[PDB]
Amino acid sequence: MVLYFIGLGLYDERDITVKGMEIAKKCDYVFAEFYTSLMAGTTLGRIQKLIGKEIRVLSREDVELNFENIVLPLAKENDVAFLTPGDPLVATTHAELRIRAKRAGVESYVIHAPSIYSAVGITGLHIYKFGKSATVAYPEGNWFPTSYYDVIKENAERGLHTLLFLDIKAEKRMYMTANEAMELLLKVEDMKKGGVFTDDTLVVVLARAGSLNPTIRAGYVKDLIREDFGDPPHILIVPGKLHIVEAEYLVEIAGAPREILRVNV
Amino acid sequence: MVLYFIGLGLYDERDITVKGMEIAKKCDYVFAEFYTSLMAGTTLGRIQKLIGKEIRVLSREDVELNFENIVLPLAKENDVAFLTPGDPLVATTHAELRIRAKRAGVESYVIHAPSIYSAVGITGLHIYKFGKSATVAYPEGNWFPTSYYDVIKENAERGLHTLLFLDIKAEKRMYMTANEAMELLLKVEDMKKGGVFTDDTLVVVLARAGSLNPTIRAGYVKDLIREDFGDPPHILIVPGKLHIVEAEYLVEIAGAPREILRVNV
Numbered sequence: 458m459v460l461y462f463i464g465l466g467l468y469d470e471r472d473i474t475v476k477g478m479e480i481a482k483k484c485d486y487v488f489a490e491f492y493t494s495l496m497a498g499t500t501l502g503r504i505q506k507l508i509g510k511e512i513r514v515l516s517r518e519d520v521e522l523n524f525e526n527i528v529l530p531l532a533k534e535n536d537v538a539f540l541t542p543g544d545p546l547v548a549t550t551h552a553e554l555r556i557r558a559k560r561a562g563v564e565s566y567v568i569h570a571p572s573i574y575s576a577v578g579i580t581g582l583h584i585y586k587f588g589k590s591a592t593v594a595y596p597e598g599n600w601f602p603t604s605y606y607d608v609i610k611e612n613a614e615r616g617l618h619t620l621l622f623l624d625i626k627a628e629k630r631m632y633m634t635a636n637e638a639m640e641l642l643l644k645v646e647d648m649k650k651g652g653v654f655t656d657d658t659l660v661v662v663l664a665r666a667g668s669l670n671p672t673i674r675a676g677y678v679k680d681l682i683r684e685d686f687g688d689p690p691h692i693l694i695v696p697g698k699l700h701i702v703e704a705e706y707l708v709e710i711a712g713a714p715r716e717i718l719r720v721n722v
Numbered sequence: 723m724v725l726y727f728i729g730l731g732l733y734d735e736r737d738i739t740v741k742g743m744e745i746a747k748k749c750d751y752v753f754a755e756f757y758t759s760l761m762a763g764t765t766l767g768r769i770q771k772l773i774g775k776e777i778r779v780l781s782r783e784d785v786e787l788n789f790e791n792i793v794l795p796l797a798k799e800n801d802v803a804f805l806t807p808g809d810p811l812v813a814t815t816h817a818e819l820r821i822r823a824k825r826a827g828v829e830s831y832v833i834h835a836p837s838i839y840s841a842v843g844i845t846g847l848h849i850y851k852f853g854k855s856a857t858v859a860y861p862e863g864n865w866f867p868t869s870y871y872d873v874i875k876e877n878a879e880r881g882l883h884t885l886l887f888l889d890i891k892a893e894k895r896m897y898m899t900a901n902e903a904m905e906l907l908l909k910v911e912d913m914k915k916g917g918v919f920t921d922d923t924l925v926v927v928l929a930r931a932g933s934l935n936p937t938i939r940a941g942y943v944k945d946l947i948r949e950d951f952g953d954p955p956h957i958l959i960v961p962g963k964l965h966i967v968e969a970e971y972l973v974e975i976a977g978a979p980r981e982i983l984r985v986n987v
């Protein structure tokens with residue numbers, strides 16, 4: 458009669474918390490979703506071996522349309538686990554799955570795990586200075602979305618950092634790179650002429666957060682746009698005016714040019 | 723030859739990530755600090771038992787003034803770990819310690835852990851809608867901090883949620899409750915009179931995130947200001963304009979007034 462929402466963390470099968478691992482191990486049934494994101498540093502087989510359980514993967518449709526027909530029935534008389542990359546309920550639509558559980562007379566509990574929202578602290582940027590967050594989406598057909606650009610403008614206008622999630626095609630395992638995102642942003646700048654993102658804009662790139670060897674780079678677009686940040690996933694950040702302490706960390710830890718100590722502080 | 727910053731998580735010792743546990747288990751020396759936050763569900767003994775190592779707890783002074791004299795010296799000839807609650811680089815100034823490690827010729831790595839910054843997702847509020855964050859600090863003598871009031875104001879004008887970290891005096895064992903935070907906010911409201919925080923302001927309280935049964939409550943200040951949310955730590959949130967799905971969750975899961983379902987578009 459219990460449903461556990463368990464986060465898998467940032468990168469590999471060891472990014473789950475001990476609490477999450479032990480509880481998933483005691484569950485009769487274990488489901489997981491990999492449509493909101495992926496666990497780039499591991500595989501389903503590796504996650505299965507860690508918790509010692511068979512894992513049934515669920516598609517977006519399985520969850521959004523039939524969660525109550527696939528997961529909740531079993532959770533009525535057994536202990537069930539629902540695994541998701543990152544931290545549970547940070548997805549966006551998953552929170553309402555708890556309401557579904559309620560309607561079904563099922564108890565649900567949340568087992569947290571690291572999320573990129575907090576992991577970006579490794580960039581040396583103060584977490585309290587982050588403003589509204591956004592996602593850079595791939596244009597397609599006649600659709601050219603640009604709202605993420607206005608988000609940067611509004612944040613930077615208030616001296617706030619902007620965390621930009623990059624588009625991902627989970628099912629096809631396709632990731633948008635920090636490079637492509639910068640190209641897209643420059644293209645949007647050229648159309649809106651707001652002076653929000655140019656070759657001179659200072660940006661931070663965080664790749665493979667959760668890994669023991671993530672790529673943390675900071676510098677001006679003109680210099681990073683064609684740099685190789687390694688394998689995905691990549692996270693792009695457009696900082697607001699920096700506190701000297703933030704800048705010194707980007708210089709010392711992220712290889713930022715000394716120039717930022719006088720231009721972006 | 724290495725220093726590891728390892729987060730212990732939100733509430734108890736099992737909130738550490740498996741990665742963090744495995745690494746800690748093999749370190750020669752393990753240091754820790756328990757002043758940046760409160761882990762209400764465990765003890766030093768249990769953490770020690772989990773990683774099978776003796777842990778030396780440091781004070782804020784030990785860290786801020788003598789980190790390079792107490793910890794770094796040992797990291798030059800051994801594998802050393804530094805443990806902190808939640809995520810080590812979120813709402814703390816520990817990032818700067820990585821610069822000290824560098825200047826001492828010590829390589830450092832960061833192992834993330836569940837953080838309150840992302841755990842707020844359990845309140846049902848969209849995490850991308852959060853704006854600048856702030857801290858509600860205890861007034862000291864004639865000094866009465868009020869900047870957090872302005873943060874709320876700014877976010878609300880943009881319709882963004884505001885995450886308010888609550889103060890903590892570890893050595894004095896003082897942990898600010900959401901009730902005290904609200905009292906302080908009302909006082910600041912009387913002084914500035916900006917109509918930012920009143921008895922009619924909707925608020926969300928999250929207490930002891932990470933435990934299996936955290937306290938999740940939403941409602942008008944007038945009704946929550948005298949409510950018992952249980953033992954600390956507590957965190958206060960002032961939502962901006964709500965999306966219908968956020969309202970439904972607050973009502974269904976956090977016992978908020980049904981009237982908030984009638985949003986003003």
Ligand SMILES: Nc1ncnc2c1ncn2[C@@H]1O[C@H](CSCC[C@H](N)C(=O)O)[C@@H](O)[C@H]1O
Nearest residue numbers: 759808809812837838888930931955956957
């Ligand atoms: N489990 C928990 N539940 C509610 N609030 C919490 C919490 N853990 C931390 N906080 C909040 O955050 C403050 C400490 S700020 C340090 C936060 C830490 N690095 C992290 O990543 O979580 C506390 O005073 C409290 O207001």
